Each structure stands twice: as structure tokens, then as C-alpha cells.
Symmetry: D2
Subunit: 410 residues, 4 copies
């Protein structure tokens, strides 16, 4: 018979008509959101159907078939456990417990150099997960908005390489980490910044994106890009943080003039204008939830997991994850790579963009920072997750000891 109601008998159990509330509760348990863009046709029909028959609320064979025929491919995969994490309900409990285990880590100091980011209660703590199949889960303050800050750095690097290619972008900027407390330097021996993840590298990267338009079009061009990446979830902009960031980044200006004087920018660059653009991209706002989609886009070869849409070339995404692995956690990058072994990127607002390649993207957020600039709970969470799961970049898929593999059965 048909795909469309092989799947029916599947959910229908023994009876002949599936309640609407049952089917929905099934769908939700596969971790799909009833607001999933890929499921719009089917949810709209259901809603239309609840209207045109108060008479209900149960779906027979053909009623079910005229709702799910629209998105039958994605609905089949979800219901037959063909997603990257099959028992997703089990998984999210573990996530919750990791969350609670972290929440108890009261250490750290809120970034206060800008008045805006000391307006956030330290209590706040959120984690959001988006799988490469569009499975979602959150716990904590995942709907509070904050600035990306340095979390934006791999995102705009990715745009450059997507628009300009590996070879060109790296005429201007390095690809290695700089060395334990080989820190205070701006350029390396070839008079390029060390990599996209440091400020000096980021600033140069900013100067390549959409060259030859003004700092309003460049800004919108990038937001368009991020909007696609986040499946059109929340992507705002705090100007309060921008005016503060600019009237305060003396160090950044030092970096600007230093790069100028050493001719690090492309020909015909307006350096002070790049600095405003840079301060702007730092002020872009996300929620845990929206960011986790973005991260999942990196986790998913560049295709946005909840829309299907190709946002980034594989070349861009691969390049980006490579530098997040080595340069992503300020002076904690070497330790984080050893013990965690995941691409991550931290920002001074308490955010940590985290990617488990081929599995999921995440965003942890908690304002209080440790001595190295990283979110304390965020760090504790990340070490826990890889203690529990074989997610380390050099964990084994076949032999992994006491760990748990969310990619498998029971």
C-alpha cells in the first residue's frame, strides 16, 4: 500500500481513528516542533480540519492521509526512529540532568566593562539543542536575548569563505592558534593575524564581507545570512551594547590602526568604518534557541536543519569548525580541545556556541565568566556532556567504554 497510511496503522495502534491529540503527542515526542517550518502544510491542514468538523476530534484513514500527504517523507522518518537521535525523549532527560548539575556552579564574574551586560542577573542559565534533523529541546532561560559578542566570529568568517573562498580569505588571515600565552601579539610572522577567532583576525575578516557597499547594506546582508542560518528564529540587535562597545574599545582601535599601518586590509579599505561594522556584528542578538539552530546549521554540512535550505558551502562550514576546534575558547582552547574535543565558540556575554558534527548544534548561556573569559556553567556543561556521551572528536563509535551513545537504540 501507500506510505501515507502504513504510517497510519503505525500510530493508529489497533483502533480505526487516531485522536488528533494523540498524533500530536507522538510527533512532539520525536522532538519535532509543532511549529516546524517543514511541517507547515500538515499542521495547517490539521488546524483547518479541526475547524471544518467540530464533529471529532478523530482522524480516519483518508482524513489522516489528506493531512500528512504533504510532508510524508519527514513524518515517516520521525515515526520510524530514522532520526540522528532515535530515543530523543530519553536524551532530553540526560540534557536536563546535565543542566541541573551545571546550574549549581555559582562561580564567576559578570562582564561589567560594558554597563549593558552587567544588567543581566547571574542566576540566568539556558541550554538549547537542535539536532541535524530538527529535534529541539531546551531547559532554563533559553528565550532570554543576549549579544553574540565573540560568538559571531565563526559566523562571519563562514560568510567570507562562502562568498570568497578559502584561498582568498586566507591571503589576509591565518589558520593556527597562536600558542599558550603567546597572546598579547596581533600579527604572526607573515604579518597576518593568527586566525579568524581572535579580535585582530575577526576585524580583518569583517573588512572582506560585501566590499564596496556601505555599513548599512553590509549589516543587512549579514543579518539576511544569519536569519537563514537560524531558520528565521530570533536575530535582533542591541544598539545600547553597540554604543557602549564603541565608546570603550580602545584596544580595538589600537588593533585597527596597527593593521592599517602594516597594510593588513584589502586595498581601499576605510578602517574606522570597519571598526563600526565590527562593533555592530558583536551587538547582534540571539536567544539560546535561535542560536542552537545556527550551530546545528554548522553541524549539518551547512544546510539549515529546520528549513532544508542550503545556507553555507561545505567548504565554509568545514573551515569554520576547524578553527573553532583550535582557537575558539580564548586561552582555554588547548585544554577545551583535549578534554572536550568539540568545536565551540565563547563570547563575553556568557554564550558558548557548540557543535557536535553530524549530530547537533547547541547554545549554552550564562553571564558569569571565569578567569579566561568563558562562561562557568557553560564550561561545566560541556565537560559533562562528553563525559556522558561518546561525542568527543576522537571518541570511538564502536568501542567507547562506560559512555552513552545517543545515536543508538537501547
Amino acid at each position: 500500500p501507500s506510505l501515507e497510511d502504513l504510517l497510519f496503522y503505525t500510530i493508529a495502534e489497533g483502533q480505526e481513528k487516531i485522536p488528533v491529540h494523540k498524533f500530536i503527542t507522538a510527533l512532539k515526542s520525536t522532538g519535532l516542533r509543532t511549529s516546524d517550518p517543514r511541517l507547515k502544510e500538515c499542521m495547517d491542514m490539521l488546524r483547518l480540519t479541526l475547524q471544518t468538523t467540530s464533529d471529532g476530534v478523530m482522524l480516519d484513514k483518508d482524513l489522516f492521509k489528506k493531512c500528512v500527504q504533504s510532508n510524508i517523507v519527514l513524518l515517516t522518518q520521525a515515526f520510524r526512529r530514522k532520526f540522528v537521535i532515535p530515543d530523543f525523549m530519553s536524551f532530553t532527560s540526560h540534557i536536563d540532568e546535565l543542566y541541573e548539575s551545571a546550574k549549581k556552579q555559582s562561580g564567576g564574574k559578570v562582564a561589567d566593562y560594558i554597563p549593558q551586560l552587567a544588567k543581566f542577573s547571574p542566576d540566568l542559565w539556558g541550554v538549547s539543542v537542535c539536532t541535524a534533523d530538527g529535534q529541539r529541546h531546551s531547559t532554563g532561560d533559553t528565550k532570554v536575548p543576549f549579544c553574540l559578542q565573540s560568538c559571531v566570529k565563526p559566523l562571519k568568517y563562514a560568510i567570507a569563505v562562502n562568498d570568497l573562498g578559502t584561498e582568498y580569505v586566507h591571503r589576509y588571515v591565518g589558520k593556527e592558534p597562536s600558542g599558550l600565552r603567546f597572546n598579547k601579539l596581533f600579527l604572526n610572522e607573515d604579518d597576518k593575524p593568527h586566525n579568524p577567532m581572535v579580535n585582530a583576525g575577526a576585524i580583518v575578516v569583517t573588512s572582506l564581507i560585501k566590499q564596496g557597499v556601505n555599513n548599512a547594506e553590509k549589516f543587512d546582508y549579514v543579518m539576511q545570512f544569519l536569519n537563514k542560518m537560524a531558520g528565521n528564529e530570533y536575530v535582533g540587535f542591541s544598539n545600547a551594547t553597540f554604543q557602549s562597545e564603541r565608546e570603550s574599545g580602545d584596544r580595538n582601535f589600537a588593533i585597527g590602526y596597527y593593521l592599517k599601518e602594516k597594510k593588513c586590509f584589502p586595498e581601499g579599505t576605510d578602517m574606522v568604518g570597519i571598526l563600526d561594522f565590527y562593533f555592530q556584528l558583536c551587538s547582534i542578538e540571539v536567544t539560546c534557541e535561535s542560536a542552537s539552530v545556527m550551530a546545528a546549521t554548522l553541524a549539518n554540512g551547512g544546510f539549515c536543519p529546520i528549513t532544508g535550505e542550503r545556507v553555507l558551502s561545505p567548504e565554509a562550514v568545514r573551515n569554520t569548525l576547524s578553527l573553532m576546534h583550535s582557537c575558539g575558547m580564548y586561552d582555554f582552547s588547548g585544554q577545551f580541545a583535549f578534554h572536550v574535543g568539540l568545536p565551540a565558540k565563547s563570547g563575553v556575554a556568557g554564550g558558548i556556541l557548540l557543535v557536535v558534527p553530524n549530530v547537533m548544534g547547541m547554545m549554552c548561556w550564562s553571564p558569569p565568566l571565569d578567569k579566561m573569559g568563558n562562561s562557568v556553567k557553560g564550561i561545566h556543561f560541556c565537560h559533562d556532556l562528553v563525559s556522558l556521551c561518546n561525542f568527543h572528536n576522537y571518541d570511538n563509535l564502536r568501542h567507547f567504554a562506560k559512555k552513552l551513545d545517543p545515536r543508538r537504540e537501547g
Copy 2:
């Protein structure tokens, strides 16, 4: 039916009586070598049958099963295309092309600071592949013995961590890469060597291994350990190279006394003694083939692909792969990391020990080195390998553009 005669019809192909050579031929085409340890009881039963009447030999449903009972599970996986690389025959055609491509790169200079090394013709070039399922292929001078040199460093880090655990080992040696030209500073800021892949670190690591027995026992122990990792293929020792490496190795003696004075060795370490242990270890010999198994052991979570034996703990194997990633190719390390994205370790003899986690282990060998001391042909091969396949640590398993995935058939 049963697993065994079921497999009989698969090789049969309409026919009545499966010829022996037809079985061997079909066996080889899966990747497995006729001499695989796990196929002992099968091959024995075969050589036994090859004498009940030395004219044939035609296995019926019964004689076939008698010869394949013992190993039916492996034989079934092999023939049902269940191995990590299902179409191995195809795959080794690409390996062979990649080999001829790199064969045309005659640049570089054979090491010569030791007489034992400029004896090697600059045209020696071998590639050996061993997959996590035991599949073998060699093209080139893969049975010529050469010294491991710095290629041994990840193997004795492994051993140490396997015997002593992470926390004890990394009291004495760091775990990050060092810095720009850094081949220079012998210690990080905590007065440990930077990582176990540089000479200061290796030397410390040698001093943690099997403490409190003499150098003769210690060496037997590492040998025994390498024999497990190489599935009992060729592991030797080159006393010539050992002598030449010692009477002409003042830099290692320099580091030794520096380490001793800053108190980097365990209590009661006879430093000069340790150096000679280290010199012996650099002079261990392997072949492309044998070493590619060792490399496949790291690919396979610490279990030897061609015996089944647990050789190293997951902690050891993961730690080693993390540090090879970032520290494994001398100054070229960060560039390797970015472009090739695989754990590898190189050696002044022309060896590059390469690991494709969960897929395979490898060992390339061409004596002529580039200006950073890395085999020219080897480097070229590794670039092409990843240019062609989605083996790069941050390629996507699902969206990989115009790359080939040897793990898939469909």
C-alpha cells in the same frame, strides 16, 4: 536454514560445487588477506581438506560449512558487504591512483645527519592501508623496514597513559601545541614540556614507562606492546641507527640536562639512562604494512583490527589522537590540521602514520623530506586523500558536495 549454508548459496551462484580458488579469490576481493589471524581455524580446516584427496577441490554445502563454521560471523560480514568500506576493490583503485599522483613529486631531501639514512634511495615509496575491519591494501615498497623515529612518540604516549592514566602522565608533560617557530622553548609556563609530541615531552614520557626495571626489560615491554598493536606483523630494531643516533645527539643531551635541572622527571630517574632508552625507541623498525595495523589499532578504539585483542584503553587512544591532531607534524601541524584534518605523526625516516578514526589506519613512507622534515610524497598523498574523500575530521557525513564516501554503497 543457517548462517553458514546461507552464505554457501551466495558464493555458489547457481553452480553446484564452489571451487576453492573461487572462494579465496572472492575472499581477497573483500579486503581480507588469506593470512588473517581471525581466519586461522577456517584456513586451517581448508589446508586440512586440501589433503583428503589432493585433486579439486569442490566444497559442497557440507564441506564448505565444515571449513567456515568457526569464523562464519566474520565471513558473513565480509561477503554481505558489512565492512566499514563495502566496495574495497573500488576503494583501492583510488588509493592506487593517489599513489601514482604522489609518485611524481621528486622534491625534498633524504635525512643525512645519520649515515644509516642517506643510504635510503629517494625513490622508495610505499602506502599501506588497514581498515578497522581488517581490510588490507599495499601499493609500493611496503615491506622494506625503516625506523619509526618520531613516529614512535604517539605509541609510547599511548602505552604510558594506558599504564598510568591521564592525570599522572600529564603531571609531567603538557597537552597543547606550543607556538610560532616553537621547536625552541623546551618548557611551557608550568615547567612541563609542551606536549608529548615534541622532543622534550617524548623524553619525559619515556621516563614514565615501566619504572623500576632496567632498560633491557623496559625495552622488551614496549616491543611486546608494539607486537600487540601490529597484530604480530613486523616489528624490529636497528642497532646501527641506535649507535649513530646516540654518539651524535647532543641536542637530546642538552634537553636531558635541562629537564633534570628543572626537575621534570619522576623521583629517582637516571636521566642519561633514560636518553638511551629514548634512542633505542627511535630505532624501532616497522614496515609500511606492519605500522598501518598499529595505526588501525588507534582507528579502532584500541582493539587490534586483525586479532580482536584489546591493546589500549579508550582514554589512551583518544588522548593520543587529540595530540597527534594538533602536534603531529612538527611546524606544519596547524596547516596539516586545517587542510588534512586527520591525526598523523611524521618521522625523519620518511614515515607518516595516519589515522582515519572509525574508518582505517595507514602508514606512508618516502625518505625525502621537505623543509619542515615531513615526507614530500606523504604530505602530497594526505592532501589528495582528503581532497577526494570526506575523511576530514570536519567533513559532513550527509552533505559532502562532490566528495566520495567509501563508507557508503548507497
Copy 3:
């Protein structure tokens, strides 16, 4: 039998009277100039005397005594070879041979990074000598005005210490050379610039001068201070150099913002304003002749030698010569300290301000610079000087080999 009358007979030689030209010749050969401020009385009398009856042109013992009356003590020392260099007419011969030898050094590039220094002919070459007694000498292009540039660094440092003292000034700036490729860094291990002789230090020093008045007042102040130091010989300003230096000084802005960021300036500093004042100070013009007097004030413990006025404290002068010793010649400081062993300071305009303590002060000017930014002719000249005379600051006064001592009789 007293004072002014011995001086009459020693010149008249028992002749009738004294021819006025004979006296001015005798005077000029002591090294003193006719325009010497300490002689203005004597000279003025002499010209007006040759009017009461110009019918002369002689001098009665009567007539004479009343002219030399006022300056008798100085005119006596001069004529009784009491000055620091007795045989001055012989010394100026060696200076001349030294000028001609250095003149044959074709080499160097003129500073062609700013249109005001590209301006200058490479063939320009001038040397001026002022002893601590006001004995003068010039040869070459010594009345052409040029910008001090970095030659102003010791001067403005001196002023700062003169006004605020050693302790306060050295809260904001260190007192050592940097390291011979710590040339690059801006701050030492205590977040102060390494010393006042380097652009970071100079800028900070600039912020210490006449704090809390505006940049026109501060500038006027330094100008007048430099006027004292040069016995009111030419001190100018080049607005052209000023505009250029500020259109083109991206590195200096880099340094400014770095310092502001690290809180190196005194509280309440307008950093952008201190940069302009700094640019202004570099754009100060002098001639060979006026500058050699400033160098002479340093050689003379802080008294201007041609006027007698206490310009700088001994503390200020000591301090300054200490740092010119070790930090004065850019990357060539160590090689200069060893071989010439004299306090000197060079600038991009081609100048070298050279001090021989307790003896003389000099200024060398030749616009073509070497690869380290020092004047080619200047450097050569300084080496020859100390090859000839026991002026090396660790030469012996009592045992000095094949060298010559301009301070001794025969």
C-alpha cells in the same frame, strides 16, 4: 700688575698699541665666536669705540682695558689656554679631516616616507661642535634647518625630569633597553613603555609636561625651554612636517590607543591631543649650529655654555645621558654603546645629537639613513671620532694607547 693689563701686554707683545683686527683674530682662535653672548658688552664697546675716533684703528692700553673690562675673567681663561680643549685650532683640523672622511660615504636612503624628508638633497652633510666653554666650530651645511624628530626625545625627557623629578616620571615610563627583538613590543612586564627613547615612552612622557594647560601653552613652554638650551640660536617649526607626520602616523595612533587602554597616561589625559602635541614636538626645526649648543648644555651639566644660564637640573641631565647611552640609536644602541661609548640620539631627518660629557656637544646631519634608521655619514663620523680621541666613555685618561687627548697640552 693686575687683571686686564696683563691681557693687554700679552697681546700687544710690547708693540706700540693694538690693532683691532689682531685682537679679534687672536680671540677667534681660542674657539670663541665674536657673536658670543658672554662677550656682548666687550664687542659692543669695541665697535662704538671705533667711532670716538675710528681714525684709529688701534687701541690704547687705556682704550683696550675699558672694553675687555667686563669680560676679563672669560677673556683671560681663553687666552691662557684654560678651556677644556687648549689647542682648539688643532682640534678643529681633526674634526675637518673627520668630516671629509665621512663625506665620502655615498650610501643610505633618505627618509622617503613623508614629502618633507624626500625633499632634502642626499648630498647635505654638516657637523657642529660646541665645547662646554663655548668654543665653536662648523664644517659642511650647518646652517640649514631640519626637523629634530626623535632627537627631541631626550630633550623633552629632560624637561619632564627637570620639572617633576626622577621618581614621578618613572612611574609612567621605565629606564632600560628593551631586548633585541623586543623592538616590537610597546610595554614592558610592568605595563610601562620600556624607556623614553622609544615611541611608546616618548608619547607617555609628552603627557607629563605642563599638565592641565592646553596644547598651545604646553608647546610654547617647551619652545622657550629649548631656546634657553640653545643659547637662543635658531629653534624653528615646520608646519609642513607637522601636517605630514599626522596624516601618516597610523603606528603612533596604534600606540596611543594601546596606552590609553592600559592606563599608561596620567589621570585625565586627552590622548588624541597628546598625539598632536607629540607630532608638533617632532616637527621642531634646528640647525647644526643651534643643536650643537643644546648637546653642549647636556655635556655641561645643565648650564648653557655660551650664556652661563642654569637650564636643566643635574638630575635631569644625568638621567638623560644615561638613557641616550643605552637606548639612543634605535636597534643599533648596543653596538653603538660598545664601540663609540658616547651618549647620542638619532632621528629620521638625518640628525645625530652627540654628547661628550665634560668636553663638548655636537650635532651631525646627513639625511641618507642606514637600514636601522641612523645617518650613514653621522654613524661613520662618530666611530672615527672615538678611534682618534680617548672620548670613549670607558677609555682611560692616564693610559690611552695610540689615541690622542684634545684635553692635554702635548
Copy 4:
């Protein structure tokens, strides 16, 4: 009218016959020691006169002449205040206050890294002055022998340059201070040690002295050289310190091999042989008194003040004072040069070898060191000396404010 005569009635009274005790007392007051080698023929005669004509002890016009005639030139200069410091008795008062003021400085830790220096009481404190004319003064523990250690470094460099010239020696060793903390590096950018005053430099310089002879003869040759510099005062040897310094000198062996590897030693250099020679030179013993005579030879252009014997070339003496100036007090070198401005060399035994060129030499001794490695009382004394006297390199001889100048009379 003879010098012998004039001097007689000079010391007379206008009188008859000088008492012997009145002559000796008068002689001591010029600072000269009764055992001056240049005074020996005269002192024998006095002692001999007291014995013979015991019927005295009044020396008349011809008895006196019979004594002082042998050494009349020097005895004149002594009594006619011709010596470098004319009022020497006044000067010793000052030294004595300086000594007492430093004596109240109980800070410091005595070196403990070998048992030989652990032993030394913390309160030992001695100062000795020898002028370039042989005027001596001691106060405190100045006859106790202690080891030169790094205080030998300037001495053996002087010997190298004396025998081999500047050009040779400085192939092998640099001539600049390392960096305000490049100390840990052994080699500069040209693969030479930074300067003679650091261990790597000292060791290379050791390897240049008397090449091609065994250590017995080499060591003699240096000892014979040291005796000449000290006018034959105490130059001993500590075998105890030798043995300890070798069976514990691991950092030096580190330096030794590094140096061998990078090929800093002259061809045919037995590296370990050189090390032992090095350890021996560091164990050469001196007293404050004998060391002050050595320092005085350096202060005197290479002539030994109390023998008049030419010990070193002026090229050697100049070169050493140069490097003592900028590299002498380990890491405190920059600070010392700025504040004290005299050439000095400190050692871990607590000595400070001090030179006031054209004036005097000095050894201060006091075993407790500061965190920098310098004798605490030593350092204190050096600052106070230059507070009090215009001996700073860049103090002015004509304008020195409120300082005292010991080179002038009333």
C-alpha cells in the same frame, strides 16, 4: 736642590730631625700602605735603621735621604697631594659611614644551592678601596677569603681579549645585554651567547683561553694572570666549591651541550673539558682587599696601581668596563646602570666588583643575596656611594650640585 731635601723639611716642623713614627704616621695618612711594593726599598731601610742606629730614633737630613731616595718620585706625589683623591683621610671617613649605614641592612638570603656557601655567616660584611695611585682602605671583614663565582667573568673576558683581541673573541660571544627578560635564551639571533657576563657567554669565553693546552696549565695561566692584577695579594682556590659546583651543575651541562650542538665552540673543543675548567674558575678565591686591587687595575687602564706593571691592554680594559656597565648585575643591570652608573660585577658568593674609572676599584662582600642575586649590603653601598659622590658615569665634573667630589682639595 734635591727632591729628597725639599720633602725632608716638608715633614720636618721647620725642625731638626723627623721622628720615625711621625714619618710613618704621615705616610699612612696619604692612604699609602706601609707594605706598598713600590715602597719596599724605603721600608727595609727604615726597619734596618731602627735596628742598627737604635740610638735614635730621629732621622736627620741625610739619614732621611738614605731611606726615601729609593722611592722618592712616589713619596713626593704622596706628600704634595698629587694623588687622585688628595684628602684621602677625609674620604675614608665617608666610606666608613657608608659602610655603617649599609651594615644596618639585614635583608637577604645567603645562597644555599651548595653546602660551601650555606656555611657563610649572614653578617660578614667588608668593603675595600684601592685607588689608581695605590691608596688603600678597608673596613669590615676584608681578609676573609670567598669565591669569585660570576665575579670572575669580567676577569677572564679581559684575558681573552688581551691575548686574542676584540675581533676574535666576538666571533664567539656577543656584546649586548640580552633583554629585560631574554635571560632564559642561551643564544641570540646569530647563534652566539648574548655577552660574556651570562653563563653561556662565560662558558664560550672559557673555551677560547689558552687553547690546545690541558686544564692544569690553563688554570695556572689564569691564576698567574689574576695574581698580576691583584699586585700579588691573596689569590687562592676552593677545591671544596669546585667539587660541589660540578656534581650539581646540571644547568651548565644543559648549556654545554646546546652550545656544542649549535657549534658555538672553536673547532676541536672538548666540551666537558671546558666545563670543568669553567667550574674551576668560579671557585677561585679572593679577599675584599686583593679583589679591590684587581678592580683598581681595571680602573687604571690596565696598569696595576701598586706595582706599576702593565697587566692588560687598554682594548681589553675598555671592552670589559663596557660590558660590566650593561650586563654586570644580572637582571638588575638596567636599574644599576641608571641609578649607580658604575661598571660592576656581582657573584652568588655575595661579592660586588666595582670600578670607578680613572679613580678606584672596590670589592664589597656580604653573603646574603636579594631576589635578583645581588648582595643586599653590596647594592645599598653602591647607591649611597653615588648619592654622596659625583662618581656616576654621567655626573658632571664641573656642576654636581650638592654632591661631594673627592678629586678636589678645599
